[PDB]
Every structure is written in structure tokens, then in C-alpha cells.
Amino acid sequence: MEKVFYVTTPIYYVNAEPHLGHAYTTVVADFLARWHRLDGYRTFFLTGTDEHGETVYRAAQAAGEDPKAFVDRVSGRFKRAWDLLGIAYDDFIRTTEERHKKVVQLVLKKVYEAGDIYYGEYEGLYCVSCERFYTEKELVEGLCPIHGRPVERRKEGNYFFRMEKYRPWLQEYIQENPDLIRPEGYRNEVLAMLAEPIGDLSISRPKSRVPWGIPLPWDENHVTFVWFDALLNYVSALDYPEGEAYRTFWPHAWHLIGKDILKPHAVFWPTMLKAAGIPMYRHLNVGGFLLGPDGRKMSKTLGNVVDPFALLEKYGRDALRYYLLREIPYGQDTPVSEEALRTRYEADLADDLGNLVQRTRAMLFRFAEGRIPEPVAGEELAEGTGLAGRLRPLVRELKFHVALEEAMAYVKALNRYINEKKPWELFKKEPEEARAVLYRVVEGLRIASILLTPAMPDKMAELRRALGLKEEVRLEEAERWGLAEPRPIPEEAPVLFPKK
Ligand SMILES: [Zn+2]
Known part of the structure; x- marks a missing residue:
């Protein structure tokens, strides 16, 4: 109850074709929201569309459509984009909604009457x-x-x-x-x-x-x-005046934006809140540009555009999300490319994670009857249980890339461990010890899979299914050692990250 997390993305121009910029900001908000829910926070993740104005009206007339019908339709592109990106928002605010319009007028009146x-x-x-x-x-x-x-x-x-x-x-x-x-x-x-x-x-x-x-x-x-229309979405969605959502979430408001809208959020919005008698938000989290492969601002005519939906289609939603969160220090202009994604996909995911799961499954069938072995202490690997405590502040300081780096460093440790212990060699004279090693690798993977869930929720659930682990998890579970139960693993399982 005391643990509350509220995060918003900007509401986007309703008739805009969703691109990398929208995708990135929304993905980071999604990671934050999934991370906090995983850590037991009562959370609210808001996103939406900016639907009024001259420009959209021009668009609707050109389309020979009624404005309302036009935004009802084109706002669907963002909803589909979020579906494709696996964005678990709690509410999608549309400025044409009565609940929004009522709040806009209410705040306008208050500010007007305040002089x-x-x-x-x-x-x-x-x-x-x-x-x-x-x-x-x-x-x-x-x-x-x-x-x-x-x-x-x-x-x-x-x-x-x-x-x-x-x-x-x-x-x-x-x-x-x-x-x-x-x-x-x-x-x-x-x-x-x-x-x-x-x-x-x-x-x-x-x-x-x-x-x-x-x-x-x-x-x-x-x-x-x-200004007084779009910006108010952040409180109107909460039934602002006296809604419980407002009383609960507004005190913890985190707004994520691209630096392109810095001034409206850092200057305009704060003065508006002050004049309306509304408490200031807690944090304004500013992301940088996602530059093209050439290090220049992304634009269709420069020919340096990176399409997240095409990438997502090829490597999958999870890999794209992981790439965006790992490769970019939030707030710092950074070039992106399919080549850099592919590199991360083949090494961090296919190799460090995929190959290890494949090897572990084969070894479990050979030396453990196809079941997770009996639990044993983690020894050097037990340290993994302290990772959640280290990532919490990294995640909340917007250091997603560092948090993912530390989680993956542990995964690399698991690889090094199995390669150094060589269970296959130990099995001859010391079968129990071979089974102990494999247990530590599976339990270590359970832990790492939880830490990585907010980034790749689907692939991490898939990883857990591949090892017979309980799919549904909580961050605190990654903080105790020995939770993986000695159960059968599926007789068959797809390669976690197949070759592209
Ligand atoms: Zn004229």
C-alpha cells in the first residue's frame, strides 16, 4: 500500500505513424511498470493519444471523415503498436474522452478564477x-x-x-x-x-x-x-478531483518523455500545477534521441531510419526490448541499428542464455533423469540472491542498461561455472556433485530469469517453462536460494532464441 508506482508516457499525436521514438519511450515505461509490479508495488502505467487541434482536424477533413470517427480509427495504430511491443499499460487515455474533457475545464476554471x-x-x-x-x-x-x-x-x-x-x-x-x-x-x-x-x-x-x-x-x-488539454491527461486519467486513483498515484508521479518535449514538461507543466493548486510531480525522466546507424538524427530522407516493428517481426519483441534497454543509457543520444541488435541477440541472448538452457536441458536428461535435481546450497552462486537489492536503485535511477548488465554478468557467471565444473566429467565418480552443479545452474537461471522478466517477460516465461520452473514469479523470489523444485522438465522445448 505504501509501495506505489505511477509512470506516464507522453500522449502522442493521434494520427502519427508509430515509430522508434514512441516505441522506445513506451518500452522504458513498460519496463519500469513491470519491474515495480514484480517488486510488489501497487502500480499504474498510463499512456494515450493527443486528439484535438487544428492539425488533426485538417487530417480528418482530408480523409473525408468526421473528426471523432477519424480519431477513433487512427488512435488504433498506437494500440496495435503497443500490442506488438507487449506493452502492459493500465489505461490508455484519449483526450476526446468525457472524463478528460471534464478535468480540463475544471482546471481551466480553477486557474482562471485564481486570477x-x-x-x-x-x-x-x-x-x-x-x-x-x-x-x-x-x-x-x-x-x-x-x-x-x-x-x-x-x-x-x-x-x-x-x-x-x-x-x-x-x-x-x-x-x-x-x-x-x-x-x-x-x-x-x-x-x-x-x-x-x-x-x-x-x-x-x-x-x-x-x-x-x-x-x-x-x-x-x-x-x-x-497545453491545458494534453498535459492534463496525467491527472484526468486518475479521476483527478477526488478519485481514489488520484489520491493514491499522483503523490508518486513519474513522467517519462523524450527531450523533444522537455520545456512543456519542465517549465509549462510545473507552473500550471502550481497555479491549479495541484502537487508537483515527483520526477521528470528525460530520454535522449535514438540516432540512426550513421550517428545522425533519424529521418526518412536521410535514409537512416530504424524500424522497431520490422525488427520486432524478425528477432521478436523480447530481443528488441532487451536491446533498447541494454544498449542505451537513458537520456543519452545513442545510435542504434539492426547490426547492433543482431550482435546483442546472438551473444547476450542466443549464446549466454539460449545455448546454456539447451546444454542444461540435455545434461538434465543425461545425468538427472530429465528432472531438476534435489536442491543444494549455492556456494559462489548463492550471491545471485543479492542482485535484486542492487538493481532496485539502478532501475529507479534510470540506469536500465547497468541493471541489465549486472543481471547478464551473473548469467555469464553461470556459463563459466558449468564450463569450469564440467558436470559431464564429474558424473562418473561423483554423480551427486554433478547433480549439485546442474541444480545451481538451474536455480541461478531461475533467479536471472526473474531479474530479466521486466525486459523480456515472454522469453523469460519461456525459459522458465523450458526448465520446468514455475512461470509466474515475484522479485522477492529471486532473493532466496533453493526455490527450484526437483520436477520433470518438458521432454521437448524450442531453442530459446533461434538463429536468424
Ligand atoms: Zn492569402
């Missing part, structure tokens, strides 16, 4: 012929993209949130809570962002331009624009 929202007029570029505003980006050589004529500077009104007002509080809060933003380098970048005025935040757009969105409670002619 933090005003109607301001900030000149913009306007084309009289189109009778519409245009951002600098949409102009063609500073001219209307339609009429090829100049545009005039007109003032447009929008509602703004007094964000600058909360800058001093945010600076102080970060100073007093140094582990709030992690990795540390991102904390420093945020403090640098806060070194100067941050201005106020545009939070709405007239409905005449953006009809697809949540109207402002005090002005139906304006719709909530991005």
Missing part, C-alpha cells in the same frame, strides 16, 4: 485576402502561400496563462529538489531556460479557426489549445 488567465492581444501576420492569420513558417518568402502577396500585421486576441509569474517559484523548487529533473544534464538545461523571463503562455485559439477542441468554460468562442 492567472487573461485575454491578451498579440499581433500576428494576417492576409486580408484569405481573411486568416499565418505563422512565419507558413509564409512563402514572407508572402501568403495562397495569394503570393504580402501580409499585414494585425492583432489577434487569445487567452494567456500568467506563466512568468511562477518562474521564481519554479527556480526555487528545482533548486530545492535537485533530483526532480533527470538525468542531471537536463536539470541544468532547464535552469538555463529559467535564467531569463519565460513570458506568458498562449492557451487558446478562437473556435472559428480551431473548432476541434475543448471550449474554454468562460468563453465558448475559444477552444483550449494544446
Whole structure:
């Protein structure tokens, strides 16, 4: 009950084709959630889709579909992606949901009534012929993209949130809570962002331009624009006001994001929470870019894209997940490639794990009648029971790669052990000792398989089935020696990680 874990991924643009970036962030959240459930934490893992706005509406019109029907359909790509990646989220929040819309308006009203929202007029570029505003980006050589004529500077009104007002509080809060933003380098970048005025935040757009969105409670002619809509998913899914989920999980909120949305999460979101009278989140965990094989930012035209679904299809979900968690120090820009995945797949998995299980099964049939032998003390291998205590802080400090490295180091120790003891040689004069060695290798594997479960839950369950071990496990089970019972192993079993 005291052990509570709450983790969120950003909600993604609903019509985006899911790619490596979405996959990575969601996979890391999944690992964290599965790890905490395994360690007895009452946990809630949230993910979702950002469904309102001008862009999606443009998309729906182009598709000749009703906005609601369009997002109902395209939000399915993310749900399928998560199915493919084996993501066990507890809830999938869609901003079109009434439960979300109610919270957005409720918080808008609170912040408005607290005196933090005003109607301001900030000149913009306007084309009289189109009778519409245009951002600098949409102009063609500073001219209307339609009429090829100049545009005039007109003032447009929008509602703004007094964000600058909360800058001093945010600076102080970060100073007093140094582990709030992690990795540390991102904390420093945020403090640098806060070194100067941050201005106020545009939070709405007239409905005449953006009809697809949540109207402002005090002005139906304006719709909530991005920030107060999307960001609130983190509390709306918890039935925020007085829902039990909110009272229970919000005090432990961990948000995982890509560094691409650092400012909205480290600057905007905190001031919004402060103004709304909502407690600050516990941690903002910032991931880096997954660069292409060439060390450059991933992009279709550079031709350096790595497709997680194609990789997943070829090597399987578990191998991909393991690769992403092991190879990348969370927060640090890192190049990825099929070649690096393949390397990890053939050595760490097929060899250190697969071959060892294959060898162990063959040896159990030859020297132990096809059953796990009678339990015996672990001796040098008993140390494996202390690994969970070492990985707990590594995992919670976002050092997934180090945690996986230590779990795999033990697996390598199991290999070295069996290769040094040579049960097959010991069997002649000392059959009992040969059986003792094999027991230590199977019990060691049971332990390692538990530690690795959050990364490869399916393959680790498969590994346990291959050795006749109980499939369903708990992290604490990896902390005691001698749990593998002397039972029959399946007479046949597939190679855990077949050649590709
Ligand atoms: Zn025009």
C-alpha cells in the first residue's frame, strides 16, 4: 500500500505513424511498470493519444471523415503498436474522452478564477485576402502561400496563462529538489531556460479557426489549445478531483518523455500545477534521441531510419526490448541499428542464455533423469540472491542498461561455472556433485530469469517453462536460494532464441 508506482508516457499525436521514438519511450515505461509490479508495488502505467487541434482536424477533413470517427480509427495504430511491443499499460487515455474533457475545464476554471488567465492581444501576420492569420513558417518568402502577396500585421486576441509569474517559484523548487529533473544534464538545461523571463503562455485559439477542441468554460468562442488539454491527461486519467486513483498515484508521479518535449514538461507543466493548486510531480525522466546507424538524427530522407516493428517481426519483441534497454543509457543520444541488435541477440541472448538452457536441458536428461535435481546450497552462486537489492536503485535511477548488465554478468557467471565444473566429467565418480552443479545452474537461471522478466517477460516465461520452473514469479523470489523444485522438465522445448 505504501509501495506505489505511477509512470506516464507522453500522449502522442493521434494520427502519427508509430515509430522508434514512441516505441522506445513506451518500452522504458513498460519496463519500469513491470519491474515495480514484480517488486510488489501497487502500480499504474498510463499512456494515450493527443486528439484535438487544428492539425488533426485538417487530417480528418482530408480523409473525408468526421473528426471523432477519424480519431477513433487512427488512435488504433498506437494500440496495435503497443500490442506488438507487449506493452502492459493500465489505461490508455484519449483526450476526446468525457472524463478528460471534464478535468480540463475544471482546471481551466480553477486557474482562471485564481486570477492567472487573461485575454491578451498579440499581433500576428494576417492576409486580408484569405481573411486568416499565418505563422512565419507558413509564409512563402514572407508572402501568403495562397495569394503570393504580402501580409499585414494585425492583432489577434487569445487567452494567456500568467506563466512568468511562477518562474521564481519554479527556480526555487528545482533548486530545492535537485533530483526532480533527470538525468542531471537536463536539470541544468532547464535552469538555463529559467535564467531569463519565460513570458506568458498562449492557451487558446478562437473556435472559428480551431473548432476541434475543448471550449474554454468562460468563453465558448475559444477552444483550449494544446497545453491545458494534453498535459492534463496525467491527472484526468486518475479521476483527478477526488478519485481514489488520484489520491493514491499522483503523490508518486513519474513522467517519462523524450527531450523533444522537455520545456512543456519542465517549465509549462510545473507552473500550471502550481497555479491549479495541484502537487508537483515527483520526477521528470528525460530520454535522449535514438540516432540512426550513421550517428545522425533519424529521418526518412536521410535514409537512416530504424524500424522497431520490422525488427520486432524478425528477432521478436523480447530481443528488441532487451536491446533498447541494454544498449542505451537513458537520456543519452545513442545510435542504434539492426547490426547492433543482431550482435546483442546472438551473444547476450542466443549464446549466454539460449545455448546454456539447451546444454542444461540435455545434461538434465543425461545425468538427472530429465528432472531438476534435489536442491543444494549455492556456494559462489548463492550471491545471485543479492542482485535484486542492487538493481532496485539502478532501475529507479534510470540506469536500465547497468541493471541489465549486472543481471547478464551473473548469467555469464553461470556459463563459466558449468564450463569450469564440467558436470559431464564429474558424473562418473561423483554423480551427486554433478547433480549439485546442474541444480545451481538451474536455480541461478531461475533467479536471472526473474531479474530479466521486466525486459523480456515472454522469453523469460519461456525459459522458465523450458526448465520446468514455475512461470509466474515475484522479485522477492529471486532473493532466496533453493526455490527450484526437483520436477520433470518438458521432454521437448524450442531453442530459446533461434538463429536468424
Ligand atoms: Zn492569402
